[PDB]
Scaffold this motif. Sequence first.
Motif, PDB file in Angstrom:
ATOM      1  N   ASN A   1      -6.434  -0.716  -0.899  1.00 39.17           N
ATOM      2  CA  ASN A   1      -7.125  -1.808  -0.164  1.00 39.17           C
ATOM      3  C   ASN A   1      -8.539  -2.107  -0.758  1.00 39.17           C
ATOM      4  N   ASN A   2      -8.857  -3.411  -0.864  1.00 39.69           N
ATOM      5  CA  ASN A   2     -10.229  -3.884  -1.199  1.00 39.69           C
ATOM      6  C   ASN A   2     -11.100  -3.844   0.096  1.00 39.69           C
ATOM      7  N   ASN A   3     -12.161  -3.020   0.053  1.00 38.77           N
ATOM      8  CA  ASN A   3     -13.017  -2.725   1.233  1.00 38.77           C
ATOM      9  C   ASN A   3     -14.440  -3.236   0.925  1.00 38.77           C
TER      10      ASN A   3
ATOM     11  N   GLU B   1       0.829  -1.223   0.000  1.00 37.20           N
ATOM     12  CA  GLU B   1       0.000   0.000   0.000  1.00 37.20           C
ATOM     13  C   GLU B   1       0.869   1.282   0.000  1.00 37.20           C
TER      14      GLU B   1
END
Length: 36
Positions: free
Chosen positions: A34-36, A5
Amino acid sequence: ECVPENGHCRDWYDECCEGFYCSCRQPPKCICRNNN
């Protein structure tokens, strides 16, 4: 160790980790996001 990141990537050549997807807003400028 992939590209973490805020590490500057490329959804073609420089691979971000499995945990943050490589968000490439206008190629070549990109980061890990980030995948949220």
